[PDB]
RNA sequence: UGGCACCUCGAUGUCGGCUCAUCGCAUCCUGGGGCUGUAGUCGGUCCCAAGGGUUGGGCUGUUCGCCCAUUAAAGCGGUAC
RNA sequence: GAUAAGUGCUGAAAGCAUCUAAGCAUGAAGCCCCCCUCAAGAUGAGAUUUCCCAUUCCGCAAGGAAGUAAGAUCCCUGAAA
């Protein structure tokens, strides 16, 4: 769920910026990932 | 040869307006002013200053994050004591001593910097009690 | 809010309606005149003072018959301020008696514990002894002052000295029956304060 | 010495270093800081000098 | 291709008022909604048809272009028209009735929930299943309306609770 | 744990118990959450959290350890054992 | 009352999207109050009520002496201390 490697997986995969911190967010539950 | 001076000092009271000026942009020449570095007659070991009261303290703004970064630390003498509160409370609630500890920061040390700090007056609101010594206003150079 | 005080006088018992034994402590109270009242305006917040236990002439003095000269009554004794009331249905020179109290209230009770002079460390603060036996030295004393670092002793540590005679509060304590021929008061419990005291009587502000 | 003449030249519109170079560069004045402040206390003839000063910093 | 200049049609056949740079008044038939605007944006509110004016700079002025045109043009529409929100009750007789202007809710939790709604919004049931959430703005109908989901979310499991009249809930499978 | 060697002073007494304790969080219990290979009941794992709490004996050995019976839990570390 | 990890509403930059860049919410045995105690030597020395009266001598001068008023203490009988 942190990973402090972000990196995209899924086809789908989005990557945002959301209060200056890096963000991955995809339709299926097992992808959220925050740069820390 | 030169002119020291004692008991022959005059002071003045004048009125300072608070209302979108920086918190420390101001503390200083109100330090200055109240020190008495603006006289050809100064003398470090006398206190020739002059009063100055300020009003509407409750306007006073900072920069960047400072509502939310700056916090005050007053831990006390008993074990595990430090207390702290954030900036926006201290504008909110206690806006006189928020002005009074960057004031006296930016004085000296000793018996005479006590003095000095004695002939301050800060004011939450517009209005001063102090119309029987007919203060007059000033402008700041900024 | 509501109150009056009086003095203490003992301990008992009452069987109640169950056949219930329940300890008891009695309450003197007699009528209690209102001396003075304070406004926010004049004075900051709202109270009212209380007299109680009028005294002989020879034993007051001038300002304190100049003071009572508004309500219309003797010197008093005793006399302390009461907050939180309603600042109507009071006039200076009032009774106050101990019908303001039902049978089932609740209560808290102030008072000021009896002295037991120098004490102890064991007895003031309840700590623990040494052993007695097996070549020991060290019985009822304080224990260690704290690590070696600081260069000097924390504020905190826990000594002998002068026990007790302070103000303390007990809340939460039941009424059993009120008495206004002879002006009582039966509270269930126990109370802080040696005999002949005074004993404050404040309605519950729940806890 | 030099925060008095600091204040004289406040006074005036000026700072001392601008007025310390005006007065260097306009006719030599070899006035040092103690006669500067001794004027000062005593001015209006501190004035004289200041836009001595000025006139030259043009 | 960029809402922030792109203007449309504003009939603002409303009394559409306007104030002093940072404040707006938007009256009409529905009511009345009335909000700051970006002060540090050029308003520009002429003959019936406004729009805003980007001044300079790049990564702040844009975002506030969009943004502040797109609430001139939602508030000009709701003071003339509302918009609603609906929200399903399918599960086990989780009863919704209407007890006067408040509402209770009969889901699994032992003791009834009651909803109080806030004034000026609206609030119709045509059937104990179906919530109808009524309104001229549209971020205190969205409020509401997650409030009311908020009390009973679905499950993956199976289908009940609250939904949102039609809401894509992902349904899982297992022992 | 070594390597190396700066205040060694009429010494750089090192480890276990007793009496009193204080601080860190890299969380043992209690509070709030995200994922599950989560039908529930019970779990696993990962975040936020330092207010309070965190046991009586046998064995020889002062130490380290092995056991008996409980409890919501029987947490790691610094302060010249 | 304001928050942490979280869950969110409308919303652009980027014709879509998006918890955010404008703005508006909810959310912990943490935090600030609510409960009990001390507290104006807080030299920033605070407030309200009630008493006593503006005496007599020296000193042009500031001032310096003497009896007092309201009120206390010394001394004696004691303990709820």
Redesign the pocket.
Known sequence: ??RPSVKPICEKCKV?????KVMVICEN??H?Q?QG | TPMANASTIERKWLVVDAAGKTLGRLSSEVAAILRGKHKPTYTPHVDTGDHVIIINAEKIELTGKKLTDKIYYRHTQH??GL?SRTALEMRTNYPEKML?LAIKGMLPKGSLGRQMF?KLNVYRGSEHPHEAQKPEVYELRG | TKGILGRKIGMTQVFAENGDLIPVTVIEAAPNVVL?KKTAE???YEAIQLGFDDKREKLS???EK??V?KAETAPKRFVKELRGVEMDAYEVGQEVKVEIFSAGEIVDV?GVS??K?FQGAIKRHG??R??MSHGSR?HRRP??M????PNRVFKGK?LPGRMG?????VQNLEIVKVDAERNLLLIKGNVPG????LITVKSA?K? | WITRINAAARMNGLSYSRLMHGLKLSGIEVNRKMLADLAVNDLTAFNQLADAAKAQLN | ????KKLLEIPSDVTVTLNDNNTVAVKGPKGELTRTF?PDMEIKVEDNVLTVARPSDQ??H??????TR??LG?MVEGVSKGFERGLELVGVGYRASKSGNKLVLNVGYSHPVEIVPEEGIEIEVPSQTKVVVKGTD??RV??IA?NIR?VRSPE??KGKGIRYEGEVVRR?E??
Do not use: C, F, W
Not at chain 1, 16 to 20: L, N, P, T, V
Not at chain 3, 194 to 197: C, F, Q
Not at chain 5, 1 to 4: A, E, H, P
């Open positions: 769920k942190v945002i910026r959301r209060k200056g539950p097992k959220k925050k | 074990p595990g207390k009074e004695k | 003075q004049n004075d900051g003095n001038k300002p100049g003071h000269a102030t009896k002295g002079g700590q623990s040494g052993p060290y224990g260690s704290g690590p070696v670092d826990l005679g302070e103000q303390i509060t040696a005999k002949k005291s502000v806890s | 291709s960029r809402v922030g970006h990564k702040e844009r975002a506030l272009h969009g943004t797109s609430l939602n549209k971020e969205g409020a997650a908020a993956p499991y899982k297992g022992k």
